[PDB]
Symmetry: D2
């Protein structure tokens, strides 16, 4: 039985307010989740592709012998994620993720502040056609904190790319699952999305698979 | 002019721990001087109060003859926002957003801080910081409504050393920036220094700000 | 298989070093070896700092793709320039150049490291091994790839020493079309097996590129 | 005045360049000049990219302070290494080394630029001048200074191209006590007057350090 997902995203991009609400479902054992959300303030003023990675690390597979620490945290006080994303044209996206849990349900309430995107930014065009896959390097900073880092790109219609560098800080109320904490080497997290967006209605399917070594 | 009154609220989280301070002071832009004294409403801070000195109003800086402080100028024409990303040498990050409201003779600042990624052994969780040192910010426009700022900032440590950060700021103006900033003649520099009188519950600053084209 | 010859010359905080040696590798196995000896006595810093300086030609690529570094051998070659920023402020600038002879790759590599503090873990015996990495690679135009990865070393006491690496690879001819026509990144997993003293350094490195980890 | 001799060798996106020349400077006036000629033909990128590679010795310091770069001439000197990150992704790594004789400084500088995209403004004639900067300098222990600054260029049709520069200066002996005993940063204001073609480059540079402006 897939876990239900509810989600709200609220924020500002270059000072323009936006808000989306929606949900989907996910099966952590398959590393799969879906999320569909709709704007509550009319059309977005920027590319909906910017929000794909804002639209739940709980739904990722982990290798034999390791436990998804985000899933583990559900029963032991949870975690928050805070990401700082620096785009190649100077835009900055700051995102904070907080969660609550009910029986068979995760509810996310996410806050986004994007600033410094130039007027000529690709995010104010329909040039972005998709988000590309990423592999995040995760390692513990201490018993209650994981540090994540990855490079992310979008593909553009004329064949180019738009890139960012992402740094993430995951803070856990209780100690991180011992399989992750005691590893003595990083864990990698591969992620990819399938996006079906308009300017008012956004939808993703995401796959997340953590690994020590690729096949 | 009589000094402008200042009212200030700072709300935020540092590595998940909530804090809030409220207070105020006053400032005289023609002197480049302002004061702000604030008290924590959530008991003693869990980190060095010096970390908040540069969060505790660019309106109060002098500008050279032939130029006008664009922050001061914005008061009567829709105002501005400031958003800063500060990267500390031990990996901690502060994201700070500044919002303002104005009255005759008064500015009211409501500021939001998110600090994450500071390691347990960070100098900020000790009493080692003894003062904030002076800075010179490089300011230059991106089009008529946006300024970018950047500076390196250091703190002095009890033991004689330094703790450093790099700060990048984006200011977005509702109306065109004062034209003295927009003539394609290069950046404006803003020298700032503070005198700090802090405890872990009561913080106080006198700040001086002086902009210049040449020293 | 190909023979490997290698020279590394550099300075760390101004102190000159030079290593010389070589090995061999089998691109189809994604495997290479390199053993090098210092020519200026013992290194003044941890030999593990040089493991990732001691040949992208020797990486496997997924079915349908060709290793572009390997491809470049018969088409003008490539250079790599990396800037590595360590969590203590140290910076390593490394540039890699290659020549090719029959059955052989010769690398001549230049390293300039600066700003490592006196208390740097590099001036101790705390580093015990390099950890695995996954590099994100994507084309910046037809003749250049951009790479980025986070790298950590494991420390004796259980901790990590971290860096961020950005790489620019410039090709004299167009990058192999399987990589240019790919329309997203290629990921390069690397791991190294190190057997170092302060004068004699040895690695076995495995390199495996992938689009997806399953 | 002190005579200056200078060579700059490097590559940008792979393409080798070399310039040689020199000038003179007067430290008490914070002024120096340098004119250099390309020896590998016309440059393939904007000559304004090289103005800040074309001698910290020639800056003024406030009353009671000594220029630590000038002072180091007699006790082993210093090296400077800079990493410059441009807003379009290009990177310049620049290393500076110096040799001294009576009345002369000789600089031999190495530049490696990589990662500038084919559409970069550096491959056009859009840059028309380098703008002024203020470097933040502070010590890391007795033998090392760290520098940081933002630098902009002005463009023909208005607006700016920007970079961030981080520098590491390493001294053979301890930095002058007036700099180490300062208890906070020193600021170094610099500006340049440029007269460049793609084969012949020339600068006049002024440098003035201060604790407060």
């Amino acid at each position: 039985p897939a876990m239900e997902i509810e989600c709200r995203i609220t924020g500002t991009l270059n000072g323009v307010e936006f808000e989306l609400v929606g949900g989907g479902e996910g099966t952590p054992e398959q590393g799969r989740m879906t999320n569909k959300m709709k704007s509550t303030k009319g059309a977005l003023t920027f590319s909906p592709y910017l929000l794909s990675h804002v639209m739940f690390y709980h739904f990722g597979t982990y290798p034999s012998g390791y436990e998804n620490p985000f899933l583990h945290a559900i029963n032991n006080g949870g975690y928050t994620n805070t990401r700082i994303e620096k785009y190649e044209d100077g835009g900055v996206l700051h995102v904070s993720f907080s969660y609550r849990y009910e029986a068979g349900r995760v509810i996310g309430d996410f806050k986004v502040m994007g600033t410094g995107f130039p007027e000529d930014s690709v995010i104010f065009t329909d040039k972005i056609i998709r988000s590309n896959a990423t592999v995040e390097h995760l390692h513990p900073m201490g018993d209650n904190d994981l540090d994540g880092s990855f490079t992310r790109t979008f593909s553009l219609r004329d064949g180019g790319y738009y890139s960012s560098v992402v740094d993430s800080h995951m803070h856990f109320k209780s100690a991180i699952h011992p399989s992750i904490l005691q590893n003595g080497g990083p864990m990698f997290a591969f992620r990819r999305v399938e996006e079906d967006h308009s300017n008012t209605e956004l939808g993703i399917v995401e796959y997340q698979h953590a690994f020590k070594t690729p096949d």
